[PDB]
Design a protein around this ligand. Structure first.
Ligand SMILES: NC(=O)C1=CN([C@@H]2O[C@H](COP(=O)(O)OP(=O)(O)OC[C@H]3O[C@@H](n4cnc5c(N)ncnc54)[C@H](OP(=O)(O)O)[C@@H]3O)[C@@H](O)[C@H]2O)C=CC1
Ligand code: SF4
Ligand code: SF4
Ligand code: FES
Ligand SMILES: [Zn+2]
Lengths: 92, 693, 111, 103, 178, 71, 73, 328
């Protein structure tokens, strides 16, 4: 839904977890957002990664290899999307 | 009177698989009740009771036979000692494994086996590790009354892998069953009758099948032994490490039997979820590579053209200087197919902080979709393929690449009569393959339901569709994968409880790479690029790299990339290090260091991190646990070792599609399977296995 | 109980692997399973250049395999944690006793 | 000596006892093995204290008892000419490792 | 056996065997008290501590097992009172009863590390003077940690550097099927 | 040979491989031979029964001696 | 009569002379193997190199073999 | 080099050295360093086989291979340097012997080993050991010869390290052990020239540690003439003050003017004349050691010191002189 991600960040890594009670908002966010996000950024490595118990984070690699870590410990879907928006903004 | 009976747990911690907790048959093993599922042979009803019944031809993976009577436990009300291997446990049956009739039956049979058997134990390669020796020294009689002319048998030529001394062989038929069933090639046979029985091919016929080097572990006798491991060692000298394998991306489990500083013998080990007890002949006999053509000293290029084995300080200094004096977007970090997760993470974190994003595994072609983890995994476990009803091997030639995946497919074609479809190049398959088409056109024909096999894929309860990552190289990879996922959504393949969609890979690093996001964004990298940094990648086309590129080949053998390399950095092999690997099904094994690194070699990740600190980029971690924490940061799947982490996201998130190419049918991704990587190419056994075709 | 044990300091920062040795694939017999062993990696073994034989430098070369074998992962972990080693327990892969019978060889392929 | 360490308090008391013993014995140590010129009494006290402090995080009383016993053994074998003297004088980042070995 | 009837039941606490030499696997607290019994008793007169065999079971929780052998020169019988004390459990010493236990307990502490309570002169008897580590344990490697000793420029002195030797070749003879 | 060039550095005394490859194969009657050793069944190797069905000589693995069918 | 030492007694007689047998060397000389039989060597221990024995890495042995199991590149 | 090991005493270091002067006071420390860091040493001895016996230990089963060789006969030096990549040269004398003259023992040998190592292409590092202040026009013919040796080993073989150790102290040395056993002339120490000499001794262990440190170093320390001076620039009298601290004796020095000494050392300088009898190795009164004692040029100038080897020498008080306790 952002569009300008492929031109600002280098990759986005979302460490949701498979079937935890928490990290379920992150799964909902991905399920409802990733199709449109990638259809809008057809080349960015929007990395989705599973686990057993890893806290749901959202990393972001910018140009020179720096990395912002946003912990989606309790953020809901619009909160997660606003966090991603902040990530994209903090790179451009 | 308040006794303390022993726990009486199963024979090898064997998980007993009840099909349902209702049909548990209760049989008495030596007056000690045990609840075994319905259908358990008496032998398994005793292996549940901890009683280890001596067996010569009964293999759990193989079929059941009576080719010998070494088990003969005495059940309560049968007139004769019943062979435990074939007698199904009936409810209430009383099994007496140590009654005098059972012990006399065992001694009787172990005298017959040692009667026509030659005294080859000293010259037998499997002298220490022998079922016959360890059953004679434990259940058979201390003396033999046979003093006559034993029968003798000529030695059949079964190829450059299995040395055969059929005189030792006891004709238990275990191998002639293994080649017919698991290996599925049907070359071995029990020719003749009586004592004149001879096991082997009736016409001189090298066992052209791969996966047929495991007949030696199948063989309970020295007869069939590894010809590469001709006599080089003994069952007691070999110090064993429970390492993993990296030749093919199935990530089969392994025991690197090493004697001192070198790898004498690579033998499989039980891991029911990847390779039951079988390993491909690419893994059994690749150990010879690890000692040939090894890179042992960091050689930079002088002012002439030949190498100069400088120390590590000088080589790292020259590499660091040449990365400092190059444009950042011109650095590329091609990572080898054998590289572990750590060193690929260190390579990513290095060539990233250097201002580039051109790190990628050796096999993954341009524009791989490594976003969702189902897109490069075997979502259905390698064990899951046992529940599949129909397979659609899209290209993928799984007999060649990922040989244990094909072993599971053959086992689950034999056991449950599954039917496979094959849309790929014309190949040879162990089982009935039903080749559908050569190119992607027949893939559209299935995607649009206009194929006589789409009606099959629909009706099957649990279908599976293996799509080899060898077709990611094609330009229309998105189109092929879209048609694949269309077949999935159409035939209900990927459903909430089955997930029959699965892509297999042919390179061990490829799964871990695509997990760490090591994606080749596009071309125009590796071209117009001036710091190619091959991290053990030999199959990278050194004809692509520009002539002025300062290739720095951080390999451990070097076949063609080493000749181009302006500076070499000798790394460790897969046995000398401890690297976290991920196989195709997502299982994340971790090798255990067996033999010391050769010469002045270093760990892959150590070399890359040292090059980082020499080249100025301060990289946070400084140890193996640190870089594993960094992996947990970038991809936590590769930190929970020995645990498969399924991808909880189906294909319903992949955005959209394109048109599939009619021309350029599916191309053979692996031409040899005996020279697929560097360890295998520099080997003296894999080369000369070219005769085995 | 690492410091009182007299073991030198440099061998209490060692990283061990508490595995259970799998069955020797060559011989189908489970009489050596269930004996958990600490595995001091002890990889450094060169070749003494005078004669052809090898030559270790790590004191814990053999005792990982030889004479130090516990009977349960709990006892082995308690041992490697008393002495202060960084044990990574590698679980043993056990076999499924899948139901199988003789009468399945003579199955009927209908027609 | 019976392990009266039914608590960390008695163990710490006898730790201080052993520390006083070693400190008040440093004279004979310096005499028998001739360190009164190379090492200062401040430095030997420093080393004994750094020993007793290096192993101060022992929440187990019996382990402290055994540590004090090993220390008394070391001292009694240093006081008398049981061990020599050339060890008593001795008893008192990633890249720089990588360049040397692989371990 | 007569000895088990008279003996206070609490003293033979954990175990008791009845062949290959009979044993009273007792508790460490009741040991020297149990050794006081079986000696200075009219119907059980041992008087002779033959041996004190430290035995190390790494997989137990009480690692060691101080096996006191005992001969009874009067009644011509041999009893093996045992104990169980881990690396940091001071066990009662029976040098006061059988004065031969002095050196045997010095050896048990030296080899294993089972310190003995109120044992006068409890000092490493067998191993080297500056020996650190307890050899006859299981986790003590055969070749020792720092136990090579060679001559050097520190003349008239043999140093004690870290050890390096032809690797002891451990042979895995043990066969399956027991 | 090359294997024999690993343990023998003399290279003047004939290599054992040649000393055994130059002894002629022994004719026999049946289809199975004994080759108990030199002559004394207690001073030779464990008796190794060799099959002579093939036309080429079948070597005794322990002693290198070669036997042919002699029909 | 000078420069003698033990071990100059060949194997044909070293039996008869230590009373292990009763066969003079003139009787065991019909039993010494012709194909691999080798004359005695007096145990040249210390009498110069190339007479003394040397292992295959001693750097005094002509042809000091290298034991590195890995074949360098 | 091609090192496959962890420490030493069974490791390998790719250094198959031939320490030409191993059967000597400097040689036993250098051989012990080279063969305790795990490397072969081809100790060549000149005469009695009992000379390198104290070197068959300190090396693990062929790490130290004592070999026989004649100094004046080549084709034997080439045999000692057959299998070698390092060749250190400790062959030197402080006293002229009737058979080998000062040049034939300090210069005409070092040049000869240099040439026969050059021919044996493969000697990676050739260390050449000569005394400090051994520059031409030095009075002592030993230092002029040892200077010509440096000049001929660098010319005939470039990139050849040259240590310049000053008088080395230690057990079985030639500097302190003659003074003691002359204090056994009832505390009478004849410090010559009045102790105005300024020379920097050095614990022989540290000279050895420097000779090995130029081997373990990189391409540097090649052709660079170090000066293994040491700490605490002393004077002969002051150094003697430290001996009397170790050996329990009362300082009872005397001063000897240089003419008196050179007259007292006028005998034992007819070495080439008294053919049918070898003289007993002048220990303390050596006319050439006295000519060197005159000028205090035995001080490290701005040339390379231990600091250019990441190395700092031990002092001369305490253990690095505790070999004197055996004289109390
Ligand atoms: N000693 C000192 O205080 C100082 C010495 N040096 C230099 O250090 C080096 C070694 O010193 P150090 O060991 O004490 O010296 P030594 O005089 O004790 O001689 C050491 C070695 O030199 C050999 N050597 C001497 N002359 C000959 C010769 N003509 N032919 C063959 N071999 C010979 C000796 O052989 P053999 O034992 O058989 O005679 C011995 O192996 C020499 O170059 C010396 O000048 C440097 C600073 C001062
Ligand atoms: S298989 Fe080999 S080792 Fe085993 S009994 Fe037969 S000949 Fe002997
Ligand atoms: S060759 Fe081996 S596996 Fe085959 S029947 Fe003979 S003994 Fe059994
Ligand atoms: S194996 Fe069961 S009887 Fe032959
Ligand atoms: Zn034979």
């Amino acid at each position: 839904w952002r569009g300008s991600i492929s031109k600002s960040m280098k990759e986005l890594r979302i460490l949701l977890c498979q079937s935890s009670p928490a990290s379920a908002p992150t799964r909902t966010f991905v399920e409802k957002n990733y199709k449109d996000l990638k259809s809008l950024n057809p080349k960015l490595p929007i990395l989705i990664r599973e686990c057993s118990g890893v806290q749901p984070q959202m990393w972001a690699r910018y140009d020179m290899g720096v990395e912002r870590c946003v912990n989606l410990d309790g953020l809901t879907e619009p909160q997660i999307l606003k966090a991603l928006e902040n990530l994209v903004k903090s790179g451009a | 009177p308040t006794q303390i009976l022993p726990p009486r747990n199963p024979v090898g911690g064997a998980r007993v698989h009840f099909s349902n907790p209702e049909d548990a048959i209760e049989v008495f093993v030596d007056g000690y009740a045990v609840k075994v599922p319905k259908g358990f042979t008496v032998l398994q009803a005793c292996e549940v009771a901890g009683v280890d019944i001596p067996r010569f031809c009964y293999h759990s993976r193989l079929s059941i036979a009576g080719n010998c009577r070494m088990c003969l436990v005495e059940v309560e009300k049968s007139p004769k000692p019943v062979a435990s291997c074939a007698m199904p446990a009936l409810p209430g049956m009383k099994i007496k494994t140590d009654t005098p009739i059972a012990k006399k039956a065992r001694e009787g049979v172990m005298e017959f086996l040692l009667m026509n058997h030659p005294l080859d134990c000293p010259i037998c390669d499997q002298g220490g590790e022998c079922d016959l020796q360890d059953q004679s020294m434990a259940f058979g009689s201390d003396r033999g009354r046979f003093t006559e002319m034993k029968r003798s048998v000529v030695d059949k030529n079964l190829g450059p892998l299995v040395k055969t001394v059929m005189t030792r062989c006891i004709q238990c038929t275990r191998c002639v069953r293994f080649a017919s069933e698991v290996a599925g090639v049907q070359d071995l046979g029990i020719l003749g009758r009586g004592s004149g029985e001879e096991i082997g091919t009736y016409v001189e016929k090298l066992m052209t099948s791969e996966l047929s080097g495991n007949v030696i572990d199948i063989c309970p006798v020295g007869a069939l032994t590894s010809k590469p491991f001709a006599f080089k060692a003994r069952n007691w000298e070999l110090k064993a490490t429970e390492t993993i394998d990296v030749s093919d991306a199935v990530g089969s489990n392994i025991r690197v039997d090493s004697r001192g500083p070198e790898v004498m013998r690579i033998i499989p080990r039980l891991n029911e979820d990847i390779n039951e007890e079988w390993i491909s002949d690419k893994t059994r006999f690749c150990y010879d590579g690890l000692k040939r053509q090894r890179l042992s000293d960091p050689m930079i290029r002088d002012s002439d053209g030949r190498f100069k084995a400088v120390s590590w300080r000088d080589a790292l200094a020259v590499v660091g200087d040449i990365i400092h004096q190059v444009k950042p977007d011109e650095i590329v970090g091609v990572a080898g197919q054998l590289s572990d997760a750590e060193s690929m993470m260190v390579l990513k974190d290095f060539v990233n902080r250097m201002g580039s994003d051109n790190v990628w595994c050796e096999g993954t072609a341009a524009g791989v979709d490594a976003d969702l983890r189902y897109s490069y995994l075997m979502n259905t476990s390698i064990s899951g393929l046992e529940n599949a009803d129909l397979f659609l091997l899209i290209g993928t030639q799984p007999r060649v690449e990922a040989a244990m995946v094909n072993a599971r497919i053959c086992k689950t074609v034999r056991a449950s009569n599954a039917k496979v479809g094959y849309v790929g190049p014309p190949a040879e398959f162990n089982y009935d393959c039903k080749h559908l088409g050569t190119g992607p056109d027949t893939l559209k024909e299935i995607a649009e339901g206009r194929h006589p096999f789409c009606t099959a894929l629909k009706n099957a309860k649990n279908p599976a569709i293996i799509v080899g990552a060898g077709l990611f190289n094609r330009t229309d990879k998105n189109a092929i994968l879209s048609s694949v996922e269309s077949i999935a959504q159409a035939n209900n393949v990927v459903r909430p409880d089955w997930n029959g969609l699965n892509f297999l890979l042919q390179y061990a690093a490829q799964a871990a790479a695509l997990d760490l996001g090591l994606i080749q964004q596009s071309a125009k990298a590796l071209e117009s690029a001036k710091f190619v940094y091959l991290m053990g990648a030999d199959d990278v086309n050194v004809d692509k790299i520009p002539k002025d590129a300062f290739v720095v080949y951080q390999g451990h053998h070097g076949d063609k990339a080493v000749y181009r390399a302006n500076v070499i950095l000798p790394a460790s092999a897969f046995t000398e290090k401890e690297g976290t690997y991920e196989n195709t099904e997502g299982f994340t094994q971790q090798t255990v260091p067996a033999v010391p690194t050769v010469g002045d070699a270093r760990d892959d990740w150590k070399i890359v991190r040292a090059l980082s600190e020499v080249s100025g980029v301060k990289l946070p971690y400084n140890s193996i646990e640190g870089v594993r924490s960094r992996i947990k940061s970038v991809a936590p799947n590769l930190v929970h070792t020995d645990e498969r982490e399924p991808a909880a996201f189906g294909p319903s998130l992949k955005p959209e599609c394109k048109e599939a190419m009619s021309t350029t049918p599916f191309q053979t991704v692996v031409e040899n399977f005996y020279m697929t990587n560097s360890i295998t190419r520099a080997s003296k056994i894999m080369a000369q296995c070219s005769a085995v075709l | 109980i690492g410091k009182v044990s007299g073991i030198p300091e440099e061998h209490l920062s060692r990283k061990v692997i508490i595995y259970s040795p799998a069955r020797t694939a060559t011989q189908s017999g489970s009489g050596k399973l269930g004996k958990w062993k600490i595995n001091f990696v002890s990889t450094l073994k060169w070749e003494n250049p005078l004669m052809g034989w090898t030559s270790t430098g790590d004191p814990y070369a053999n005792v990982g395999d030889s004479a130090l074998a516990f009977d349960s992962e709990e006892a082995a972990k308690s041992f490697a944690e008393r002495h202060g080693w960084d044990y990574k327990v590698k679980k043993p892969n056990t076999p499924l006793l899948k139901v199988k019978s003789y009468s399945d060889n003579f199955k009927w392929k209908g027609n | 000596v019976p392990p009266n360490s039914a608590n960390l308090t008695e163990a710490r008391r006898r730790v201080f006892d052993f520390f006083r013993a070693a400190c008040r014995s440093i004279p004979t140590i310096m005499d028998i093995y001739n360190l009164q010129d190379v090492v200062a009494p401040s430095q030997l006290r420093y080393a004994i204290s750094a020993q007793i402090r290096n192993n101060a995080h022992i929440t187990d009383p019996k382990v402290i008892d055994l540590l004090i016993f090993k220390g008394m053994e070391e001292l009694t074998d240093i006081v008398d000419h049981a061990k020599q003297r050339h060890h008593i004088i001795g008893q008192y980042d990633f890249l720089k490792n990588f360049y040397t070995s692989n371990y | 056996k007569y000895s088990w009837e008279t003996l206070p039941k609490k003293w033979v606490k954990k175990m008791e065997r009845s062949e290959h030499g009979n044993r009273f696997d007792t508790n460490t607290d009741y040991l020297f008290q149990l050794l006081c019994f079986l000696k200075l008793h009219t119907y059980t007169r041992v008087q002779v501590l033959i041996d004190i065999c430290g035995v190390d079971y790494p997989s137990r929780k009480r690692r060691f097992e101080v096996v006191y052998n005992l001969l009874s020169t009067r009644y011509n019988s041999r009893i093996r009172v045992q104990t169980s004390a881990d690396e940091v459990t001071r066990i009662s010493s029976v040098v006061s009863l059988f004065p031969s236990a002095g050196w045997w307990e010095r050896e048990v502490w030296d080899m294993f590390g089972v310190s003995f309570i109120n044992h006068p002169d409890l000092r490493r008897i067998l191993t080297d003077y500056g020996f650190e580590g307890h050899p006859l344990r299981k986790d003590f490697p055969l070749s020792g940690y720092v136990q090579v000793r060679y001559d050097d420029p520190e003349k008239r002195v043999v140093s004690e550097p870290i050890e390096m030797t032809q690797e002891f070749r451990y042979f895995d003879f043990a066969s399956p099927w027991e | 040979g090359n294997h024999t060039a690993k343990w023998m550095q003399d290279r003047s005394k004939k290599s054992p491989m040649e000393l055994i490859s130059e002894v002629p194969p022994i004719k026999v009657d049946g289809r199975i031979v004994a080759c108990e050793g030199d002559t004394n069944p207690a001073l030779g190797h464990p008796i190794e029964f060799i099959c002579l069905d093939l036309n080429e000589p079948a070597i005794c693995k322990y002693c290198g001696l070669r036997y042919v069918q002699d029909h | 009569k000078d420069r003698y030492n033990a071990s100059q007694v060949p194997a044909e007689w070293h039996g008869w002379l230590h009373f292990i047998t009763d066969h003079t060397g003139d009787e065991l000389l019909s039993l010494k193997p012709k194909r691999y039989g080798l004359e005695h060597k007096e145990n040249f221990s210390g009498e110069g190199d190339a007479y003394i024995y040397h292992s295959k890495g001693h750097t005094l042995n002509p042809g000091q073999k290298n034991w590195t199991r890995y074949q360098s590149w | 080099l091609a090192r496959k090991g962890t420490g030493g005493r069974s490791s390998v270091s790719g250094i198959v050295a031939t320490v030409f002067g191993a059967t000597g006071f400097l040689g036993r420390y250098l051989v012990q360093q080279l063969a305790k860091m795990g490397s072969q040493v081809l100790v060549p001895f000149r005469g009695s086989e009992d000379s390198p016996r104290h070197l068959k230990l300190m090396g693990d089963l062929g790490q130290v291979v004592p070999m026989k060789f004649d100094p004046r006969d080549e084709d034997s030096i080439k045999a000692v340097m057959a299998k070698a990549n390092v060749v250190i040269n400790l062959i030197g004398r402080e006293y002229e012997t009737r058979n080998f003259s000062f040049e034939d023992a300090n210069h005409h040998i070092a040049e000869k080993l240099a040439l026969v190592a050059k021919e044996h292409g493969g000697i990676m590092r050739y260390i050449q050991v000569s005394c400090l202040g051994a520059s031409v026009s030095s009075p002592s013919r030993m230092l002029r010869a040892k200077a010509a040796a440096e000049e001929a080993v660098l010319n005939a073989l470039p990139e050849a390290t040259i240590m310049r150790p000053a008088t080395m102290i230690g057990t079985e040395d030639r500097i302190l052990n003659p003074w003691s056993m002359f204090v056994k002339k009832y505390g009478f120490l004849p410090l010559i020239g009045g102790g105005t000499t300024k020379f920097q001794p050095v614990y022989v262990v540290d000279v050895a540690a420097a000779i090995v440190a130029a081997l373990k170093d990189d391409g540097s320390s090649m052709g660079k003439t170090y000066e293994l001076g040491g700490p605490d620039v002393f004077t002969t009298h002051e150094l003697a003050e430290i001996m009397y601290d170790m050996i329990r004796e009362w300082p009872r020095y005397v001063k000897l003017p240089f003419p008196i000494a050179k007259a007292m050392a006028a005998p034992r300088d007819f070495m080439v004349n008294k053919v049918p009898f070898p003289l007993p190795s002048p220990q303390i009164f050596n006319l050439d050691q006295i000519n060197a004692l005159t000028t205090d040029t035995l001080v490290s100038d701005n040339a390379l010191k231990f600091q250019d080897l990441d190395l700092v020498p031990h002092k001369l008080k305490g253990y690095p002189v505790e070999f004197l306790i055996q004289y109390r």
